[PDB]
């Protein structure tokens, strides 16, 4: 079995990537589970904005990390070289795991 | 308090100074800047000039001083009184 686990910061960018891999999957022999929404990670930082005093003045930022799980089952060698083939984008972390 | 499976603490230079002052037989006050070292039973009777950041105060080792550390007999803050 091969599972694809891919993370990003943009959900608009991570949607098209998992769409491309599910389409290049089910073109040839991969009855996939599809993109599966694992919960997103929110990293909330809260910095002071003044160079000096005024502790009460702060700005709160956050990173959101989106997760999609494609779990290709019934794998063929065409699935593994068509996963060897494509090089999706920057900002996308893909891990194929046997 | 240090953990018991570490052993007590003494500096290399202070311990070798203590041993050479015992082997040499001489008993003048010697100086250290190492207030963090534990006193030891071979160091009884001799004078240790312990640094308090400004000076080197002479400490006379007693029977009662053995397990303690060297900084407790050199107060680093001088206070007499406000009024």
């Amino acid at each position: 079995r091969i599972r694809i686990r891919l993370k990003a910061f943009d959900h608009r960018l991570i949607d098209q990537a998992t769409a491309e891999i599910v389409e290049t999957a089910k073109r040839t022999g991969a009855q996939v589970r599809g993109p599966i929404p694992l919960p997103t990670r929110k990293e909330r930082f809260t910095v002071l904005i003044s160079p000096h005093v005024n502790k009460d003045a702060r700005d709160q930022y956050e990173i959101r990390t989106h997760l999609r799980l494609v779990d290709i089952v019934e794998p063929t060698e065409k699935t593994v070289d068509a996963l060897m083939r494509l090089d999706l984008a920057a900002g996308v972390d893909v891990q194929i795991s046997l | 308090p240090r953990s018991l499976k570490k052993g007590p603490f003494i500096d290399l230079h202070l311990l070798k100074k203590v041993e050479k002052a015992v082997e040499s037989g001489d008993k003048k006050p010697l100086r250290t800047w190492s207030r963090r070292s534990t006193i030891f039973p071979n160091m009884i009777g001799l004078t240790i000039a312990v640094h308090n950041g400004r000076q080197h105060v002479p400490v006379f080792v007693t029977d009662e001083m053995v397990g303690h550390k060297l900084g407790e007999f050199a107060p680093t803050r001088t206070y007499r009184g406000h009024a």
Binding site: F9, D10, L48, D59, Q60, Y61, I63 | -
Partner: protein
């Protein structure tokens, strides 16, 4: 913020890796449970006589641009000032302004 301080931090890192590799296998002989008396009393001092920095507890984690010691964030390696400026300029990817 005192070029001396940046020089001192980059001084402590380079000694820290080398003597870290040494004192890691020299440190475990002190307090495993059960080695002996003699290697404990030798090993305290042969951990001691190495210079003070080259220990990782004398790092400071200054800002990687301005060298500011206070207000550090480990995720960005910056002080809060340069985090906020580089976030407003859009250089930290995925760092929106949080509003919940």
């Amino acid at each position: 913020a005192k070029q001396s301080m940046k020089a001192r931090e980059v001084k402590r890192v380079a000694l820290a890796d080398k003597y870290f590799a040494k004192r890691a296998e020299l440190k475990a002989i002190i307090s495993d449970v059960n080695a002996s008396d003699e290697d404990r009393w030798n090993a305290v001092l042969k951990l001691q006589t190495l210079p003070r920095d080259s220990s990782p507890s004398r790092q400071r984690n200054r800002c990687r641009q301005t060298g500011r010691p206070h207000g550090f964030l480990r995720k960005f390696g910056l002080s809060r000032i340069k985090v906020r400026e580089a976030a407003m300029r859009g250089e930290i990817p995925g760092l929106k302004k949080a509003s919940w």
